[PDB]
Structures are given as structure tokens and as C-alpha cells.
Write an enzyme that holds these catalytic residues in place. Structure first.
Site, mmCIF file in Angstrom:
data_model
loop_
_atom_site.group_PDB
_atom_site.id
_atom_site.type_symbol
_atom_site.label_atom_id
_atom_site.label_comp_id
_atom_site.label_asym_id
_atom_site.label_seq_id
_atom_site.Cartn_x
_atom_site.Cartn_y
_atom_site.Cartn_z
ATOM 1 N N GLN A 19 0.827 -1.192 0.000
ATOM 2 C CA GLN A 19 0.000 0.000 0.000
ATOM 3 C C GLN A 19 0.874 1.260 0.000
ATOM 4 O O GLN A 19 0.411 2.352 -0.328
ATOM 5 C CB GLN A 19 -0.973 -0.006 1.191
ATOM 6 N N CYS A 25 -5.215 0.510 3.288
ATOM 7 C CA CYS A 25 -5.421 -0.864 3.733
ATOM 8 C C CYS A 25 -6.833 -1.377 3.435
ATOM 9 O O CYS A 25 -6.991 -2.501 2.973
ATOM 10 C CB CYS A 25 -5.138 -0.998 5.231
ATOM 11 N N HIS A 162 -7.399 -1.395 10.798
ATOM 12 C CA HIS A 162 -6.724 -2.015 9.681
ATOM 13 C C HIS A 162 -7.658 -2.964 8.943
ATOM 14 O O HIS A 162 -8.494 -3.507 9.528
ATOM 15 C CB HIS A 162 -5.438 -2.704 10.163
ATOM 16 N N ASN A 182 -1.347 -9.641 4.514
ATOM 17 C CA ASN A 182 -1.189 -8.214 4.726
ATOM 18 C C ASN A 182 -0.782 -7.519 3.420
ATOM 19 O O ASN A 182 -0.516 -8.186 2.400
ATOM 20 C CB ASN A 182 -0.196 -7.921 5.877
HETATM 21 C C1 LIG Z 1 -5.180 1.199 6.882
HETATM 22 C C2 LIG Z 1 -4.443 0.721 8.143
HETATM 23 S S1 LIG Z 1 -2.627 0.874 8.067
HETATM 24 O O1 LIG Z 1 -2.265 2.255 7.625
HETATM 25 O O2 LIG Z 1 -2.124 -0.121 7.094
HETATM 26 C C3 LIG Z 1 -1.969 0.611 9.684
HETATM 27 C C4 LIG Z 1 -0.758 1.197 10.047
HETATM 28 C C5 LIG Z 1 -0.245 0.993 11.332
HETATM 29 C C6 LIG Z 1 -0.941 0.208 12.251
HETATM 30 C C7 LIG Z 1 -2.157 -0.371 11.895
HETATM 31 C C8 LIG Z 1 -2.664 -0.169 10.610
HETATM 32 C C9 LIG Z 1 -6.022 2.441 7.243
HETATM 33 C C10 LIG Z 1 -5.211 3.617 7.860
HETATM 34 C C11 LIG Z 1 -6.044 4.921 7.805
HETATM 35 C C12 LIG Z 1 -5.331 6.172 8.353
HETATM 36 C C13 LIG Z 1 -4.193 6.685 7.732
HETATM 37 C C14 LIG Z 1 -3.575 7.833 8.249
HETATM 38 C C15 LIG Z 1 -4.089 8.473 9.387
HETATM 39 C C16 LIG Z 1 -5.232 7.971 10.008
HETATM 40 C C17 LIG Z 1 -5.848 6.824 9.479
HETATM 41 N N1 LIG Z 1 -7.081 2.033 8.174
HETATM 42 C C18 LIG Z 1 -8.341 2.041 7.777
HETATM 43 O O3 LIG Z 1 -8.699 2.383 6.648
HETATM 44 C C19 LIG Z 1 -9.360 1.582 8.806
HETATM 45 C C20 LIG Z 1 -9.770 0.130 8.446
HETATM 46 C C21 LIG Z 1 -11.079 -0.392 9.047
HETATM 47 C C22 LIG Z 1 -11.890 -1.216 8.259
HETATM 48 C C23 LIG Z 1 -13.095 -1.712 8.771
HETATM 49 C C24 LIG Z 1 -13.488 -1.417 10.083
HETATM 50 C C25 LIG Z 1 -12.678 -0.601 10.876
HETATM 51 C C26 LIG Z 1 -11.474 -0.093 10.362
HETATM 52 N N2 LIG Z 1 -10.465 2.554 8.753
HETATM 53 C C27 LIG Z 1 -10.219 3.832 9.082
HETATM 54 O O4 LIG Z 1 -9.086 4.183 9.427
HETATM 55 N N3 LIG Z 1 -11.189 4.772 9.047
HETATM 56 C C28 LIG Z 1 -10.823 6.174 9.440
HETATM 57 C C29 LIG Z 1 -11.756 7.266 8.896
HETATM 58 N N4 LIG Z 1 -12.762 6.698 7.996
HETATM 59 C C30 LIG Z 1 -13.660 7.764 7.520
HETATM 60 C C31 LIG Z 1 -13.480 5.645 8.719
HETATM 61 C C32 LIG Z 1 -12.576 4.403 8.657
#
Ligand SMILES: *[C@H](CS(=O)(=O)c1ccccc1)[C@H](CCc1ccccc1)NC(=O)[C@H](Cc1ccccc1)NC(=O)N1CCN(C)CC1
Ligand SMILES: *[C@H](CS(=O)(=O)c1ccccc1)[C@H](CCc1ccccc1)NC(=O)[C@H](Cc1ccccc1)NC(=O)N1CCN(C)CC1
Ligand SMILES: *[C@H](CS(=O)(=O)c1ccccc1)[C@H](CCc1ccccc1)NC(=O)[C@H](Cc1ccccc1)NC(=O)N1CCN(C)CC1
Ligand SMILES: *[C@H](CS(=O)(=O)c1ccccc1)[C@H](CCc1ccccc1)NC(=O)[C@H](Cc1ccccc1)NC(=O)N1CCN(C)CC1
Lengths: 215, 215, 215, 215
Positions: A19, A25, A162, A182
């Protein structure tokens, strides 16, 4: 259900992706699932477009996150089931900037008709995966930062942050586990995969499990 | 208001820190702000405890994110206004795992009585900052991944995803700018700092600006 | 108090020892302290007898544990201040079996007159150690099992289960620390030593700190 | 009472486990006993959760020790009698760090209504064990460090420091013995087991014997 299932061994799973420096993610999880489901409906295994969702799915937030269930709904409701190929809509967000959405010039690789949201029950998820294939799952992956291998038995399970892909499980092992794809390159974990213990809701793995439907 | 203010030049700002592999930006922003406000009330500049918030503030989500306003409210409503010194509650979440909250063995470094939530107006934030000091702000930092210096003019401004600290501005420059303390080491950007253009809501900088109150 | 003190640099500390497969940590802690205190009273640095306490101090429990304060009291109250040399009463409990107590044939290496119990305050302990030398301390060492180096910042601080020796500190370091002599060979930690963060009651280090008196 | 009883031969005893580098013997003893009592009430032999106790039983001290009687009382008074399966709350304290208690995501494997504390009498313990199954016992295990096999006849019997499980005895042997399940892997002793002489209070084996009640 079967003792153990590994969809990778069955040829159902595409290569581990990257990614990059983008919180996409959620898009990688949804797309990995669609990839597997398309293959299991008898079509060739093909890489599909995370960029399509990152740029075009405005119910989610691109490099700032999203939800796999939103992504599936967008594909069906706003893109009439169509998922473009990676080749014709390649990933462009590795440095955190998502290019504006485009429609023309892209080639449809898969079509989905809907999505299912599976029970919050690991045995049930495992039984469904055995018959119906890899499952998109939300996890708390905050404690995954130094994972190099083995079966994780104390994953911090506090906040879903995530999206990843359940590709299998092994109930015969001394510590039963899930196998998870992952999207942090093959340099992370076990060639890009993690095993988490199965049966203790490690990483909140059971909370938001779902799959596209090709049927 | 002054043409330019730099709170670093005035000795009101502690060293740039490292959140490490933990989404604790919200805590680094809240704590940076308290450090500055404490100094500005006539006290010696002191490093305060991000870990206190990450471990103990259960209205936020540790390494999976939170809100500076929640953090200010928790300090006041759950911790009697107390913010511990860094040296009495040292940061230990840099590999993504936060230790459990401990209520014992810590030393109060600063006390706050509340917080103010500033108008969504860059000129008014600037004027408040000139008189009252550094301001905690939420930003869209999705497009900050390649930044090494200069004044950012094309910041992706779509989704608040990060918390940082406004430490100054310069309205005299050919392109007026904000000066922002990040928490990604001094290796990132301008010795840990970013300048973003001022007056065009870059990175959504005006949307969620606030500050603790020591008075 | 001094910025930093290391009693090892001053020649006040004997070699790192090995308690072996015996819970005699309490005896090693008390004896390491007496060793240092005897040297600091102007006598040559000499190895003293853990076996004396393990076998003879019946207010403690040999390889099943004890308390440094009990050990000091036994030396004064039941052994009239005398501590035998290691050479004349050598350690015999490395395989978990403590030989019966003997009196004849042993040579007194040090004499103590009492012991002090220091405040539960790290600054105060540090100031005392700077002037008066290494301090016997109880710690929670349950989380020390994989320590290989560095300054520990999230020591599990829940139950005193171990006795060790404070030999110094460094308040000038970016993360202030204590220097601690362990009794688990030089293969463990930093040549047998551990640094824990100073100022946050890491490992409950302040709770039961004490020293023999040679005065 | 029978001349000899071996509950292992009767399929009432789970595999020998590994507490690892954690003083969780008390939990391994309590859990071993519950596993056996659960099977003896007519249920399938099931591995149960030592981690439940280590993490959640705050009347005991995790990797710094505890008491089997405290553990039985906590299960009944704080956990509604419930003991989770191993696979639903897997052991993760083997490197000396216990994860925090989680009340969610676990599966009940056995339920107990209380516990019985047996007479300090080896003959009566033997008779109770023949009829009612394996008994949790405290022992002095300080002198067990070199044991590789045979009947132990000279056990240091001074201080209860360990918790294990009586699984049988043999009154017919030239030297009558107890059969004891330890929690130090199958590498220790007789495939994880120790035989100690019966009738001389070896290792203080009669002093703190107890068992959960499933009835
Ligand atoms: C992907 C996760 S990651 O970046 O690969 C990661 C990194 C380190 C540790 C764990 C995970 C994204 C990251 C989003 C983000 C980036 C930068 C700043 C803040 C946030 N995570 C998501 O997309 C999650 C996934 C998810 C799916 C289903 C149910 C719950 C969570 N969702 C998420 O972050 N959001 C935030 C805002 N959005 C409108 C709602 C969902
Ligand atoms: C800090 C931001 S960061 O990690 O430094 C970063 C990295 C790359 C690009 C941009 C920013 C955290 C990240 C949290 C996170 C980690 C892992 C997976 C998903 C998320 N961001 C936050 O804590 C933001 C800050 C914020 C403050 C005020 C207003 C808006 C945003 N808040 C946040 O993410 N959340 C998510 C979940 N939580 C319950 C609500 C607040
Ligand atoms: C030394 C600690 S250790 O063995 O080096 C160790 C190992 C792993 C992790 C942490 C520490 C001993 C161990 C005693 C023991 C051995 C075998 C079974 C059970 C216990 N610990 C002690 O002696 C502690 C030290 C102490 C000093 C001052 C204040 C508090 C604690 N004391 C102790 O264990 N006891 C137990 C019973 N005794 C009568 C009271 C003190
Ligand atoms: C398990 C024993 S062991 O570690 O397998 C062992 C090792 C070598 C020799 C003998 C035994 C734990 C060890 C606890 C400990 C770890 C580190 C430092 C100090 C202690 N032992 C216990 O949990 C004992 C068991 C017991 C049960 C019933 C009656 C008597 C003893 N209990 C115990 O140590 N404690 C100490 C502190 N706690 C608050 C009270 C019970």
C-alpha cells in the site's frame, strides 16, 4: 469444517502487495477479497485495482482510511458491480497522494453483485471460508509493528484500525491459527503474511468480516 | 497582530519528538500544546508525558488514534487537571504497544483548568496564537510523505487524520506561512517542522484548532 | 546532587555473580551492598559470602526467597555484625540445595553496625547513593526475562519479587536512568547490568531501598 | 483405598505444559486440577486457560506467584465459576510478560462451584485422590533443579514455593511414591513428571492440598 484450509495452496490468492505510504489498507482488503472470489467463480486469477477505490469511492477517505463494507457497497451501488484490472487502473498512491478519479481507459476485470457480512463468530467464519473462500476482515493491527513470524497469541485487541484478508486457518496445530494476507510487502512478517491465534478473537478478527459475492 | 511570530525563538517550545510506530499523534499534539502553555504561564519549559494520555485516556484509542479535544477533556475531567512530566511517565509506545495505565509513581509537571476551541478562521487563530501561544491543530497530513522543506502550497485537504502544533506564522513572506511542529523526529521536514501556506486552509489547518488553559 | 554517578568507575563494585538455580537474589543484593559499603569505609574491595546468609539466616528462606532488610537485621542481631569472606564461606547453592549452616572455619571479611531504610523517593535515593554508595533495592523483575540492553521504560511494576543493587544513575541522559547490578551472570543484560528509566518508579525501584551501615 | 492409582492411564490428564519464564506455577496447578475434575464429571478432556488466571486474577500476582486456593476462589467469586478454554484465551506469558486482562472474546470450557481444602495427611489425600481425582498441591520444589528420574527420597522440605498436581501414587512399590505433574515441559524429569516418596511428607506435599469442585 476441514481441519485446515490454505487458499494460497489452491492458487486462489494473488501476490502480496504494498500500500506504500497511504492508509489504503481498506482498499487492499476489499480488492484482495474480490480477486479471490472472482477466481473461485471459475475465472483466471487476476490483479484488480485498489486505485479504483482509493480515487473513486467517495464514501471512503482514500489515504486517510475507509471501510471494506463501504467499498463493496460503492462497487455495487455506484460502479454497477465493476472492478477494474490493476493493469488498466494501476496503483498510484504509494507516496500518499491519490490522483483524481478517472473512468475512461479502464478495463473491467471482475464483476460482483453484492456483499455478505458474516457472523461475529470465528468457527462460523472458518466454516464459510472453507466453502466460499478468503474473507475481508477488520483487525486491530497496532501491535503488528515488529512481527517477524510465529503465531501471535497476545495481539492488542482494542480498536479496529486495519483491513486485511483471511486466506486460511489451521485447527490441527498445537496453537490453532488464522492465516492472514497483509499489504505491507513480502518483507513484513512471513513473506507478507501473519498467523494470529484462532479462537480468542485475536486483534478483534471476528468483528467485521465480510465478502463480495460473484454469484 | 504581529507580522510574524515564532514561539521557538522565544524558548516556548520543547524539542521535536518521535511518536514512533504508534498512531499517538493526537497525544503529541495535546502535550506539545500543554508544554507551551505551561511555559507561557511563567513556569520553566518542561517535557510532559504523552504516555499518560496513550495509556490512561480511555476516551481515545492509544496507538490507533484519538482527538486532542478528548485528550484535554480527559486531563481535566479524569486526571484532576494534572499532566505528568515525561521523566515520571516516559514514552514507551514507539514500537506500537502501549503499556497499561498506571496511576501510581508519576509526578505532576503541569496543571490545566480546561481548553478553548478556536474559530475556524486562520486570521483569528493567528491573532490568538500571537498573544496566547502555540495551538494544537488537526490537519490532513496524508500528502506530507515526501516533504523535506519549503512552503507547502498544494496540501491535500480532504480528511483530518493527524494532530500537530502551530508554533508560529509569517505574514511578511512572499507566500505567507504557518510554522508547524510535527512528531516524526527532526529527520522529517525542516528539523521536524513543516511550513504550509497561510490563508488558503492548507491541510484543513483551521478546522479543529484548540489549546489547553493554564490560567 | 551530581549529574551522574557510577560506583563501578570508582572501583567500589565487585564482579557480577551467579545465584544459579536458587532464589537467593535477596542474599546477593544484601551482600553486594555490604561489599560496597565496606570498600567505601576505606577497606579493600573484597567478595563476601552469600552462602553465609542462604545457610544461616533463618529469618529468610534460602533458595525460596528472603528480604534484604531481614538479612541486614540477621547479620547485626544474630551474627553480631560479622560478614564472612566468599573465599572462606563459598557459594554452594547454585543447584538449588543449600548446605547446613556452619560457623567454624570461616573468616570475617566485613563488619556492619546496622542498616538504614531509605525514603520511597527516587531523588532522595539518588542523593543518598551519591554520597553514601550503592543501595540494596527490591524490584519487580518479572519483565526482565528478555532484556539484552538499553534503558527500560515500561518495566512491569506490580509485585516486588527480586533483590538487586543500585550502583549509579545518570540524570543528564536523554532518558535519565538507574544502573543496577544483577546476579544472573555477565551473559544477562549489559555485562550483567540493567539500566531502568529513572523518575517513574520503574519496577517499583523506590519501594524498599536500603543499605548496611559500616560507620 | 487402591494399591496404586494413575489418572494419566485413565485419560484424565492433559499434556504436560510449559509455564516458561513466568512464576505462573500456581495457575498451571489450579488449571491442571480443573481440567481433570471436568473430565471426571463426564465431560471430554479439554485444555483450559492458565492465562485467564495470570491476567485477570488480581488476588494473585501473575508471573510473580500466587496461591491455588486464591485462584479457585477468584474463579468462583469473580468469574461466575467459569474457566475458559486454552484455545479461547491462549497462554502468552512465557517470556515473563502477561497481557492485560480481557473479559471479552473467550469461551467457557469448564464451570466450578467451589473447592475443597484437604487434610494435611498423605493417606487421606491418597484416598480422596483415588475416588475424586487429581489434587492441586503446594510443594517445596527448591531441590528439584537436577531431577531427571527415579523416586525422590531426600526432598528439601522447608518452604512451599511451587504449585503442582498430584495425578497418582503407588503404595506397592518398594519405596511407595506420589506421581506429580509439573509445568516445566516434558524435558524436565520423567516426561514432565516427578515421583517423590510417599509417607514422609516429601517436599511438604501434604501441607496445602486442594481441588476444585465441579459437582
Ligand atoms: C489502513 C491501516 S494501516 O495504515 O495499514 C496501519 C498502520 C499501522 C498500524 C495499523 C494499521 C487504514 C489507515 C487509515 C489512516 C491513515 C492515516 C491516518 C489515520 C488513518 N485504516 C483504515 O482504513 C481503517 C480500516 C477499518 C476497516 C473496517 C473497520 C474498521 C477499520 N479505517 C479507518 O481508518 N477509518 C478512518 C476514517 N474513515 C472515515 C473511517 C474508517
Ligand atoms: C496520528 C496521525 S499519524 O500516524 O502520525 C499519520 C501518518 C500518516 C499520514 C497522516 C497521519 C493518528 C493516526 C491514528 C491511526 C493509526 C493506525 C491506524 C489508523 C489510525 N491520527 C489520529 O489520532 C487522528 C488525529 C485527529 C485529531 C483531531 C481531529 C481529526 C483527527 N484521529 C484519529 O485517527 N481517530 C481515529 C479513531 N478514533 C477513535 C477517532 C480519532
Ligand atoms: C530472588 C528473585 S529471582 O529468582 O532472581 C527472579 C527470577 C525470575 C524473575 C524475577 C526474579 C528471589 C526468588 C525467590 C523464589 C524462588 C523460587 C520460588 C519462589 C520464590 N526473590 C526473593 O527473594 C524476593 C525478594 C524481595 C526482597 C525485598 C522485598 C520483596 C521481595 N523475596 C521473596 O521471594 N520472598 C518469598 C518468601 N519469603 C519468605 C518472603 C520474601
Ligand atoms: C511458581 C514456582 S516456579 O517458578 O515454577 C519454581 C522455580 C524454581 C524453584 C521452585 C519453584 C511460583 C514462583 C513465583 C515467583 C516468581 C519470581 C520471583 C518470586 C516468586 N510460585 C508460586 O506462585 C508460589 C506457589 C505456592 C502455592 C501455594 C502455597 C505456597 C506456594 N506462591 C508464591 O510464590 N507466592 C509469592 C507472592 N504471592 C503474593 C504469594 C504467593
Amino acid at each position: 469444517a476441514p481441519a485446515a484450509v490454505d487458499w494460497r495452496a489452491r492458487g486462489a490468492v494473488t501476490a502480496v502487495k504494498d500500500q506504500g505510504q497511504c492508509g489504503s489498507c481498506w482498499a487492499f482488503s476489499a480488492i484482495g477479497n474480490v480477486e479471490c472470489q472472482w477466481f473461485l467463480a471459475g475465472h483466471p486469477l487476476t490483479n484488480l485495482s485498489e486505485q479504483m477505490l482509493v480515487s473513486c469511492d467517495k464514501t471512503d477517505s482514500g489515504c486517510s482510511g475507509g471501510l471494506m463494507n463501504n467499498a463493496f457497497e460503492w462497487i455495487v451501488q455506484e460502479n454497477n458491480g465493476a472492478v477494474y484490472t490493476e493493469d488498466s487502473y494501476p496503483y498510484a498512491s504509494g507516496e500518499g497522494i491519490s490522483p483524481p478519479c478517472t473512468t475512461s481507459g479502464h478495463t473491467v476485470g471482475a464483476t460482483i453483485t453484492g456483499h455478505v457480512e458474516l457472523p461475529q463468530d470465528e468457527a462460523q467464519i472458518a466454516a464459510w471460508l472453507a466453502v466460499n473462500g478468503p474473507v475481508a476482515v477488520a483487525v486491530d493491527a497496532s501491535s503488528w509493528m515488529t512481527y517477524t513470524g510465529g503465531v501471535m497469541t497476545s495481539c492488542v485487541s482494542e480498536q479496529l484500525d486495519h483491513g486485511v484478508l483471511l486466506v486460511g486457518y489451521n485447527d490441527s496445530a498445537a496453537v490453532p491459527y488464522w492465516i492472514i494476507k497483509n499489504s505491507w510487502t513480502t518483507q513484513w512478517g512471513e513473506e507478507g503474511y501473519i498467523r494470529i491465534a484462532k479462537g480468542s478473537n485475536q486483534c478483534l478478527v471476528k468483528e467485521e468480516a465480510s465478502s463480495a459475492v460473484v454469484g
